[PDB]
Amino acid sequence: PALTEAKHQQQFFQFRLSGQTIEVTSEYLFRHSDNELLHWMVALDGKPLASGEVPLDVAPQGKQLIELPELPQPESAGQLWLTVRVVQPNATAWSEAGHISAWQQWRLAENLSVTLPAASHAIPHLTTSEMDFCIELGNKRWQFNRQSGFLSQMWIGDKKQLLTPLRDQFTRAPLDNDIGVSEATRIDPNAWVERWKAAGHYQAEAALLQCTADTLADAVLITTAHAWQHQGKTLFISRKTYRIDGSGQMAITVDVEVASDTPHPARIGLNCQLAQVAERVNWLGLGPQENYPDRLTAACFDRWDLPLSDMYTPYVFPSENGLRCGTRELNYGPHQWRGDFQFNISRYSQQQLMETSHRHLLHAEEGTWLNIDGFHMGIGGDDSWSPSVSAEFQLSAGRYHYQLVWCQK
Amino acid sequence: AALLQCTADTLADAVLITTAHAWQHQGKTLFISRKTYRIDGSGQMAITVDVEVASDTPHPARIGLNCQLAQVAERVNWLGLGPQENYPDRLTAACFDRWDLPLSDMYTPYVFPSENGLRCGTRELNYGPHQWRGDFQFNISRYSQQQLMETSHRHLLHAEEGTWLNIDGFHMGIGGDDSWSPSVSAEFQLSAGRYHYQLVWCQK
């Protein structure tokens, strides 16, 4: 996938946007732009409002100015985005017709949504037991273990939806850059992996500090607090509140505290094993290729839909992968999530990943594993034998906040 | 501002307030604010703020709340960066400790008036009978930001009725690489899109 990052950055054309004007700047030193078509497009959250084609006519090391016909000014809520492509109409010795040489994308304007949720004709039904809390609402039931504190299971009818409960994740299947040159034998105390291990990040014990469930007029509120500890030391504190309403939409709210003295965590999110296994995946966010926070300039914000198969990158040496960023809505099966996060979704748990040495040794698990990240650490790569993730990409704020909405269809 | 929703419920452990407002202008929505107030058996009111800023609006100078206190005390005591006024792009000199000074010293007599006095990375603020807690930045004076921005000389300023309190969970950089063009570096602009901050109001 890194290739694309490369292609994007080394492009021969550079674009600037000013008002309704696109400035094209050439970076060729000898040729004129003579096999080049500029394609522009406008869209509202993935929805195409207007397209256009403009032929490029720029002189090596020169500029062009492309004027935009008046642009659609929607009212519906959403993100207005502008996207340009440079296409080569004719083939060449090293490229077929239609080839794409460059692209750029801009966020035109945003329209925040101030619309109130439809009134409901009923409310969830909170139910207590020695073992858990059961909330129902029609055919949908959610169950919350009282000893664990987590949403341990969910139903759509008679059908159970999870294979593993939905819990906080703060680790990752260490990347090559993460490992550096550390070996069982030779341990490099600087590689992030070693720091993570030694800190106990991998073996920390989640503790419930407080579970609570309440019925309110319009909905049911659940509340938790957990702590993760390693050898007497607390590394993280997870404080959440779930809120299920008449519509059957669960609202998750996460608030994380990271001990200042602990190695920056690779991640701050949730994860669970789904029971379902669908064909495609569809999302509204940076895509379609794998992208990380310090590697996603080649990624364009739009509506992607691919086969599950394309969400796992088959690196010869298994580790975290498939991530996609800046996601706003994600659909798999009858589910659907919304917020602002990054995610990955495949048939292999991080564990597996982190234990299999060769991709051919990997075996597909029972359902689909989902990692939903509120924050993810950069992958780096200035070099593979030392820490390379720059500061800006280290989860170091101390306090993280996230919110999700989880619903079906 | 325009109310979108204002509920209330009694919980086993506390009363829970819940609001949501939208600020508009000429048909556009600049910000959406969402809070949860939660007064407990302790008389401790936890505030939860979650802002949404229209991506096509000029990043805002700040993100917080204000109010005019009816009280007026001699000192101020805080546990944050101090002891001198400090902004996000100008606080390396500041130390994190326990600060106690005269209300007077929390104002900066700049000859030509403006926002001033902010202190950052505060986790505890004490004034009178009240104590705030969290992680935010504040400023405390006898002047309103409105008065400040209306009075062109510092000598024509006058103390308002109580004590105007400003509590920000995020404030913009002051800049000043030059004073004839925007000098505020990107890292110091409030361009995130969504901001969240928590507060806990309590009295003694």
Deposited resolution, Å: 2.5
Question: Which two three-digit tokens encode residue A197?
Answer: 């291990």
CA B150 → CA A155, B61, B85, B144, B164, distances in Å? Answer: 61, 17, 22, 10, 16
DSSP secondary structure of A225-246: EEEEEETTEEEEEEEEEEEEET
Residue type for position A136: E
Domains of chain B: 1-204 (2.70.98.10)
Q: Which residue of B has its CA nearest to A398?
A: B135
d(CA A169, CA A202): 10
Elucidated via: X-ray
Residue given tokens 């000898």 in the structure block: A30
Q: Which residue of A has its CA nearest to B20?
A: A114
For A266, list phi and psi in degrees, rounded to 5.
Answer: -65, -30
Considering Cα of A21, then A27, then A32, then A36, what sign does the dihedral take? negative
Which H or E run includes A199? Answer: helix A192-199
Partners of residue B99 on adjacent β-strands? B78
Using a CB–CB cutoff of 8 Å, tell me whether B200 touches chain A: no
CB nearest to A107's CB, from B12, B52, B55:
B55
Question: Which two three-digit tokens encode residue B61?
Answer: 């100078």
Residue given tokens 């509340």 in the structure block: A223
Q: Which of A58, A65, A5 is nearest to A381 (CA)?
A: A5
CA max distance for chain A: 78
- Please classify residue B155 by burial: count the beta carbons closer than 10 Å to its beta carbon, then call 0-12 exposed, 13-18 middle and 19+ buried: exposed
Interface of B with A in 12-31 (CB under 8 A): 12-13, 16, 22, 29, 31
Q: Which residue of A has its CA nearest to B2?
A: A114
Using a CB–CB cutoff of 8 Å, tell me whether A116 touches chain B: yes
d(CA A329, CA A333): 13
Q: Which of A173, A170, A172 is nearest to A318 (CA)?
A: A173
CB contact under 8 A, A108 and B22: no
Q: Are A332 and A368 in contact (CB under 8 A)?
A: yes
CA A251 → CA A124, A243, A324, B157, distances in Å? Answer: 13, 5, 22, 48
CB contact under 8 A, A114 and B4: yes
Partners of residue A400 on adjacent β-strands? A256
Number of H-type helices and E-type strands within chain B = 1, 11
Residue given tokens 């800190």 in the structure block: A199
For residue A218, list chain B residues with Cβ-Cβ distance below 8 A.
7
